[PDB]
């Protein structure tokens, strides 16, 4: 039951989208007049409206996707918009498909993809989580940011063993502590115009924080883009160690804070293109000879749905694109298999 002022801003926003005949966003592509009319008066029980979904793509016509989720209910209430956009971004995940239940699988199956260290500089696996009961960034209140951060900081400061470490609130953070975290690439800052316009940076830095373990192989960001961004990383190619550490950590956190999960979409986050497993595994990897014939490399990468990015020579950031319609085990295994074949190729050239 959106109020009249919301609906008036929505009608303005739809006409802005309609006027931008060259706009290429998925918002513009899929927000048809009939979907728009169907959804524009709806409101979630936490007060979120279609405006809290689409405003960033209305303000930033040059968005690629142009929608965000303001709370968990929004994915169901505004499914007629989210569903085709998710299908377009994750090809083959249809509006009638169902993301499988969580399955980290047999974690002992994951290996060091580069034992002698000659290829993989470093390995990272991250996931995202929303805490059950809280809205997402566009709708969190200042009080909720504060309360969530107390819950999360207490949870992280209780981690033991390899995961033991230090929580740093962004509120009140000194310049020297900022520099210390920057030097480890652990700091985050306010987001750009796409996130500002999604109302995702309100009350900054309240409720935002950074945790890492003593070994600097585990990093958590609290209320950056999602409630929790949980990262496991280390030098070398032991994706198996990285993954098992991530799984241990996620399970330990879940004991204290339950996560938002959706039967069709998997783990729910603020970004609709990071649902499902929410998992991004990546390596920084030196493939000089395969760089001398990138058409082969893009061919192999494509059949593992790997994104190959340059980040120095033949050094690549290679990560998995898939999130939907596969398990955590399948996603990481597709990554592992992809890197193992790329390395087998490189050595034989
Ligand atoms: Na393949």
UniProtKB/Swiss-Prot annotation:
What sequence ranges are listed for the domain Phosphagen kinase N-terminal?
9-91
Which CDD domains does its entry note?
arginine_kinase_like
Give a brief account of the activity's temperature dependence: Stable at 30-44 degrees Celsius. Forms aggregates above 44 degrees Celsius.
Its GO biological process annotations read: phosphocreatine biosynthetic process
Residue positions annotated to bind L-arginine are 64-68, 225, 271
Summed up, the tissue specificity of this protein is:
Muscle (at protein level).
Asked if the record carries the keyword NAD, the reply is: no
| Single GO term (MF) | arginine kinase activity
User: What does the entry's PTM section describe?
Assistant: Glycosylated.
Q: Which UniProt keywords apply?
A: Allergen, ATP-binding, Glycoprotein, Kinase, Nucleotide-binding, Transferase
Could you say which EC number(s) this protein's record lists?
2.7.3.3
Question: Could you tell me what this protein does?
Answer: Catalyzes the reversible transfer of high energy ATP gamma-phosphate group to L-arginine.
Similarity comment text for this entry: Belongs to the ATP:guanido phosphotransferase family.
Protein name according to UniProt = Arginine kinase Pro c 2.0101
Species of provenance: Procambarus clarkii
């Amino acid at each position: 039951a959106a109020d009249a002022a919301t609906i008036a801003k929505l009608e303005e926003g739809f006409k802005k989208l309609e006027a931008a005949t060259d706009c290429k966003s998925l918002l513009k592509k899929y927000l048809s007049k009939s979907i728009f009319d169907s959804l524009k008066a709806k409101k979630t029980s936490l007060g979120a409206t279609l405006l809290d979904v689409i405003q960033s793509g209305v303000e930033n016509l040059d968005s690629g996707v142009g929608i965000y989720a303001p709370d968990a209910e929004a994915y169901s209430l505004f499914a007629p918009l989210f569903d085709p956009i998710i299908e377009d971004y994750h090809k083959g995940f249809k509006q009638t498909d169902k993301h499988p239940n969580k399955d980290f699988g047999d974690v002992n199956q994951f290996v060091n993809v580069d034992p002698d260290g000659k290829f993989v500089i470093s390995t990272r696996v991250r996931c995202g989580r929303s805490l059950e009961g809280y809205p997402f960034n566009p709708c969190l209140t200042e009080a909720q940011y504060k309360e969530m951060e107390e819950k999360v900081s207490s949870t992280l400061s209780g981690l033991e063993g390899e995961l033991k470490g230090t929580y740093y609130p962004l509120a009140g953070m000194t310049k020297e502590v900022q520099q210390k975290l920057i030097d480890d690439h652990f700091l985050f800052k306010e987001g750009d115009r796409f996130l500002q316009a999604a109302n995702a940076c309100r009350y900054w830095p309240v409720g935002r924080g950074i945790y890492h373990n003593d070994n600097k192989t585990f990093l958590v960001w609290c209320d950056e883009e999602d409630h929790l961004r949980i990262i496991s990383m280390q030098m070398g190619g032991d994706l198996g160690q990285v993954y098992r550490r991530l799984v241990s950590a996620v399970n330990d956190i879940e004991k204290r804070v339950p996560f938002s999960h959706h039967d069709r979409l998997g783990f729910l986050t603020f970004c609709p293109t990071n649902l499902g497993t929410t998992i991004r595994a990546s390596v920084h990897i030196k493939l000089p000879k395969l760089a001398a014939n990138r058409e082969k490399l893009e061919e192999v990468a494509a059949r593992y749905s790997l994104q190959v990015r340059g980040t120095a020579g033949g050094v690549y950031d290679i990560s998995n694109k898939r999130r939907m319609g596969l398990t955590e085990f399948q996603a990481v295994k597709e990554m592992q298999d992809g890197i193992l074949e790329l390395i087998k190729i490189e050595k034989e050239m």
